[PDB]
Enzyme design. Structure first.
Site, PDB file in Angstrom:
ATOM      1  N   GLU A   1       9.370  -1.023 -21.283  1.00 38.97           N
ATOM      2  CA  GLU A   1       8.065  -1.666 -21.142  1.00 38.97           C
ATOM      3  C   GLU A   1       6.896  -0.691 -21.061  1.00 38.97           C
ATOM      4  O   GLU A   1       6.197  -0.650 -20.054  1.00 38.97           O
ATOM      5  CB  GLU A   1       8.066  -2.565 -19.911  1.00 38.97           C
ATOM      6  CG  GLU A   1       9.235  -3.518 -19.886  1.00 38.97           C
ATOM      7  CD  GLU A   1       8.908  -4.803 -19.179  1.00 38.97           C
ATOM      8  OE1 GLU A   1       7.851  -4.868 -18.523  1.00 38.97           O
ATOM      9  OE2 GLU A   1       9.717  -5.751 -19.260  1.00 38.97           O
TER      10      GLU A   1
ATOM     11  N   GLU B   1      16.507  -8.382 -21.523  1.00 34.96           N
ATOM     12  CA  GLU B   1      15.772  -9.004 -20.421  1.00 34.96           C
ATOM     13  C   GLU B   1      15.295 -10.432 -20.683  1.00 34.96           C
ATOM     14  O   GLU B   1      14.366 -10.672 -21.453  1.00 34.96           O
ATOM     15  CB  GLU B   1      14.569  -8.144 -20.031  1.00 34.96           C
ATOM     16  CG  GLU B   1      14.944  -6.753 -19.586  1.00 34.96           C
ATOM     17  CD  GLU B   1      13.834  -6.077 -18.817  1.00 34.96           C
ATOM     18  OE1 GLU B   1      12.946  -6.793 -18.306  1.00 34.96           O
ATOM     19  OE2 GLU B   1      13.859  -4.832 -18.710  1.00 34.96           O
TER      20      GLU B   1
HETATM   21  O1  LIG Z   1       7.191  -8.945 -17.589  1.00 37.22           O
HETATM   22  C1  LIG Z   1       6.926  -9.712 -16.421  1.00 37.22           C
HETATM   23  C2  LIG Z   1       6.083  -8.875 -15.474  1.00 37.22           C
HETATM   24  O2  LIG Z   1       4.693  -9.131 -15.766  1.00 37.22           O
HETATM   25  C3  LIG Z   1       3.760  -8.388 -14.965  1.00 37.22           C
HETATM   26  O3  LIG Z   1       2.335  -8.388 -15.286  1.00 37.22           O
HETATM   27  C4  LIG Z   1       1.620  -9.413 -16.096  1.00 37.22           C
HETATM   28  C5  LIG Z   1       2.448 -10.363 -16.985  1.00 37.22           C
HETATM   29  O4  LIG Z   1       3.376  -9.636 -17.788  1.00 37.22           O
HETATM   30  C6  LIG Z   1       1.533 -11.210 -17.858  1.00 37.22           C
HETATM   31  O5  LIG Z   1       1.069 -10.355 -18.896  1.00 37.22           O
HETATM   32  C7  LIG Z   1       0.336 -11.797 -17.072  1.00 37.22           C
HETATM   33  O6  LIG Z   1      -0.603 -12.185 -18.089  1.00 37.22           O
HETATM   34  C8  LIG Z   1      -1.621 -13.028 -17.604  1.00 37.22           C
HETATM   35  C9  LIG Z   1      -2.958 -12.251 -17.688  1.00 37.22           C
HETATM   36  O7  LIG Z   1      -2.995 -11.247 -16.680  1.00 37.22           O
HETATM   37  C10 LIG Z   1      -4.180 -13.158 -17.613  1.00 37.22           C
HETATM   38  O8  LIG Z   1      -4.253 -13.625 -16.275  1.00 37.22           O
HETATM   39  C11 LIG Z   1      -3.996 -14.321 -18.586  1.00 37.22           C
HETATM   40  O9  LIG Z   1      -5.209 -15.098 -18.660  1.00 37.22           O
HETATM   41  C12 LIG Z   1      -5.127 -16.124 -19.653  1.00 37.22           C
HETATM   42  C13 LIG Z   1      -5.649 -17.443 -19.015  1.00 37.22           C
HETATM   43  O10 LIG Z   1      -4.693 -17.936 -18.079  1.00 37.22           O
HETATM   44  C14 LIG Z   1      -6.030 -18.519 -20.039  1.00 37.22           C
HETATM   45  O11 LIG Z   1      -4.819 -19.042 -20.562  1.00 37.22           O
HETATM   46  C15 LIG Z   1      -6.867 -17.893 -21.145  1.00 37.22           C
HETATM   47  O12 LIG Z   1      -7.079 -18.886 -22.112  1.00 37.22           O
HETATM   48  O13 LIG Z   1      -6.166 -16.853 -21.763  1.00 37.22           O
HETATM   49  C16 LIG Z   1      -5.962 -15.712 -20.914  1.00 37.22           C
HETATM   50  C17 LIG Z   1      -5.300 -14.635 -21.769  1.00 37.22           C
HETATM   51  O14 LIG Z   1      -6.276 -14.092 -22.648  1.00 37.22           O
HETATM   52  O15 LIG Z   1      -2.848 -15.056 -18.265  1.00 37.22           O
HETATM   53  C18 LIG Z   1      -1.637 -14.311 -18.485  1.00 37.22           C
HETATM   54  C19 LIG Z   1      -0.458 -15.230 -18.215  1.00 37.22           C
HETATM   55  O16 LIG Z   1       0.594 -14.874 -19.101  1.00 37.22           O
HETATM   56  O17 LIG Z   1      -0.238 -10.910 -16.110  1.00 37.22           O
HETATM   57  C20 LIG Z   1       0.708 -10.274 -15.218  1.00 37.22           C
HETATM   58  C21 LIG Z   1      -0.058  -9.477 -14.170  1.00 37.22           C
HETATM   59  O18 LIG Z   1      -1.363  -9.199 -14.665  1.00 37.22           O
HETATM   60  C22 LIG Z   1       3.961  -8.645 -13.462  1.00 37.22           C
HETATM   61  O19 LIG Z   1       3.739 -10.011 -13.157  1.00 37.22           O
HETATM   62  C23 LIG Z   1       5.415  -8.352 -13.122  1.00 37.22           C
HETATM   63  O20 LIG Z   1       5.700  -8.559 -11.744  1.00 37.22           O
HETATM   64  C24 LIG Z   1       6.333  -9.211 -13.996  1.00 37.22           C
HETATM   65  O21 LIG Z   1       7.688  -8.971 -13.671  1.00 37.22           O
HETATM   66  O1  LIG Z   2      10.826  -8.828 -13.388  1.00 43.16           O
HETATM   67  C1  LIG Z   2      11.817  -7.810 -13.460  1.00 43.16           C
HETATM   68  C2  LIG Z   2      11.161  -6.514 -13.884  1.00 43.16           C
HETATM   69  O2  LIG Z   2      12.013  -5.895 -14.869  1.00 43.16           O
HETATM   70  C3  LIG Z   2      11.509  -4.700 -15.405  1.00 43.16           C
HETATM   71  O3  LIG Z   2      12.428  -4.254 -16.359  1.00 43.16           O
HETATM   72  C4  LIG Z   2      10.241  -4.972 -16.157  1.00 43.16           C
HETATM   73  O4  LIG Z   2      10.479  -6.005 -17.101  1.00 43.16           O
HETATM   74  C5  LIG Z   2       9.214  -5.525 -15.198  1.00 43.16           C
HETATM   75  O5  LIG Z   2       8.007  -5.870 -15.874  1.00 43.16           O
HETATM   76  C6  LIG Z   2       9.756  -6.759 -14.466  1.00 43.16           C
HETATM   77  O6  LIG Z   2       8.876  -7.111 -13.405  1.00 43.16           O
END
Ligand SMILES: OC[C@H]1O[C@@H](O[C@H]2[C@H](O)[C@H](O)[C@H](O[C@H]3[C@H](O)[C@H](O)[C@H](O[C@H]4[C@H](O)[C@H](O)[C@H](O)O[C@@H]4CO)O[C@@H]3CO)O[C@@H]2CO)[C@@H](O)[C@@H](O)[C@@H]1O
Ligand SMILES: OC[C@H]1O[C@@H](O)[C@@H](O)[C@@H](O)[C@@H]1O
Ligand SMILES: OC[C@H]1O[C@@H](O[C@H]2[C@H](O)[C@H](O)[C@H](O[C@H]3[C@H](O)[C@H](O)[C@H](O[C@H]4[C@H](O)[C@H](O)[C@H](O[C@H]5[C@H](O)[C@H](O)[C@H](O)O[C@@H]5CO)O[C@@H]4CO)O[C@@H]3CO)O[C@@H]2CO)[C@@H](O)[C@@H](O)[C@@H]1O
Length: 368
Positions: free
Chosen positions: A162, A293
């Site tokens: 990632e 994943e």
């Molecule tokens: O792989 C899982 C991992 O994700 C981590 O971070 C990201 C997550 O991957 C994802 O990209 C998420 O995206 C958000 C984004 O941050 C905005 O909030 C986005 O906004 C949208 C909004 O809701 C409306 O729909 C609008 O129309 O469009 C916008 C987009 O242009 O919404 C997205 C939802 O998918 O953000 C998180 C954190 O920023 C962590 O969560 C990690 O713990 C996790 O395992």
């Molecule tokens: O959620 C499980 C975690 O696994 C890791 O490999 C990445 O994919 C992270 O973005 C994720 O938060």
């Protein structure tokens, strides 16, 4: 003798097209499963996990190695790499686990560095400093690849997990480097450290080295979401040959099969997520495509066996449930993982378009 190959759009063992069905171990001890004599502690558990994997009728386990430099690799005072680990045991540990995995007919995908998070100043500089990256290649990686390249069950090296976690999203004339869109999509959640050019350069060079030492080796990158490894949907595919090679002139610095991670945010798939499309629309038939994943906890509740079945039916070359140790957010339990793995058990459907051989029979070494 026979190692897992990547041809056209499919994985192949002994000519027979193979589908990678299994789990992420990811780890037993985060960043200290191998090296510094730590393998004596985690080893038994990992082996047992390989057992569960096979008994449930799977063929692959994805295991992380260096992670965040907690044990791997060994740096000096200046940030240059001296060895695999301080006790120089990493290669022996990995070799051991590979042997066991083979004995249980299970492939392994060794993930070198983490990219979702990378809070190690030395690892972080491997992206920026060429001489330090070269130090890692020369003193750590090349010995690992050279020592482990005679091992079946070693089906792929993953350079970075990632890379968008620690991406610094920005504009750039070059298609490959531009990241204008990824900021709003939630990229850089681990801190915006590395611009795309640096990640592609790094990966370029790592993969280059791995292939220089092992011509057959399969190198890959496992991306957060699909927005990063497809040219369709207006998205962009950064980790294809042209871009990687474009960042650091290593012609063989290329991945051999794409890989997408996917989770449901709010119980909603991304509109174009791997489970709302098929392999074919991602228009990446030049290399295989694995769904490393996924978790039946962070899906749309299609059912775990239904997700495995979906992957096998809609063209994908593999499906790996997220973490077998049952820990973290969006992680299945080892039991339910086993259950899902039992959905493609003993399966062999080489009728093209469908996954292929699951229960593989792997060789040992030839030596001499
Ligand atoms: O792989 C899982 C991992 O994700 C981590 O971070 C990201 C997550 O991957 C994802 O990209 C998420 O995206 C958000 C984004 O941050 C905005 O909030 C986005 O906004 C949208 C909004 O809701 C409306 O729909 C609008 O129309 O469009 C916008 C987009 O242009 O919404 C997205 C939802 O998918 O953000 C998180 C954190 O920023 C962590 O969560 C990690 O713990 C996790 O395992
Ligand atoms: O959620 C499980 C975690 O696994 C890791 O490999 C990445 O994919 C992270 O973005 C994720 O938060
Ligand atoms: O964040 C907002 C802001 O970001 C800007 O982008 C920044 C980016 O965020 C990083 O901070 C980055 O920092 C890197 C430097 O650019 C530079 O490359 C630096 O060089 C290191 C090198 O990697 C290596 O570690 C080197 O090793 C030395 C060693 O320390 C010893 O001295 C030995 O004797 O010699 C070796 C040399 O081989 O030390 C160098 C120290 O300079 O690495 C930094 C990594 O943190 O900088 C980016 C700016 O280019 C901008 O985008 C900005 O617009 C935005 O607002």
């Amino acid at each position: 003798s026979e190692f897992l190959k990547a041809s056209g759009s499919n994985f192949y063992y002994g000519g027979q097209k193979v589908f990678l069905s299994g789990v992420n171990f990811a780890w037993r001890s985060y960043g200290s499963d191998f090296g510094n004599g730590q393998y004596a502690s985690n080893g038994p558990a990992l082996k047992d996990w390989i057992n569960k994997v096979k008994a449930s009728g799977g063929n692959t386990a994805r295991v992380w190695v260096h992670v965040e430099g907690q044990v791997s690799p060994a740096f000096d005072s200046h940030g240059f790499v001296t060895s695999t680990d301080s006790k120089k045991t990493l290669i022996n540990d990995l070799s051991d686990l590979l042997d066991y995995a083979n004995g249980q007919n299970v492939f392994l995908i060794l993930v070198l560095f983490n990219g979702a998070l990378q809070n190690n100043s030395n690892v972080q500089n491997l992206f920026w400093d060429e001489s330090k990256l070269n130090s890692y290649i020369n003193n750590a990686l090349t010995p690992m690849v050279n020592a482990l390249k005679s091992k079946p069950s070693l089906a792929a090296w993953e350079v970075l997990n990632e890379p968008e976690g620690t991406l610094q999203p920005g504009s750039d004339q070059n298609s490959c480097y531009d990241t204008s869109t990824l900021a709003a999509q939630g990229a850089g959640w681990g801190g915006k450290k590395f611009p795309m050019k640096q990640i592609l350069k790094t990966i370029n060079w790592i993969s280059s080295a791995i292939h220089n030492a092992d011509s057959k080796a399969l190198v890959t990158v496992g991306s957060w979401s699909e927005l990063t490894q497809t040219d369709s949907f207006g998205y962009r595919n950064h980790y294809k040959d042209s871009c990687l090679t474009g960042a650091g002139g290593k012609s063989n610095g290329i991945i051999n099969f794409y890989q997408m991670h996917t989770y449901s945010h709010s119980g909603k798939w991304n509109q174009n997520a791997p489970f709302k499309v098929n392999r074919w629309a991602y228009n990446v038939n030049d290399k295989p495509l694995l769904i490393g994943e996924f978790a039946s906890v962070c899906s749309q509740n299609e059912g775990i066996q239904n997700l495995y079945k979906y992957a096998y039916n809609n063209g994908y070359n593999g499906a790996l449930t997220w973490q077998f140790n049952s820990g973290g957010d969006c992680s299945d339990t080892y039991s339910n993982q086993m259950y899902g793995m039992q959905a493609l058990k003993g399966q062999n459907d080489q009728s093209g378009g469908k996954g292929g051989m699951v229960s593989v029979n792997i060789n040992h070494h030839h030596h001499h």
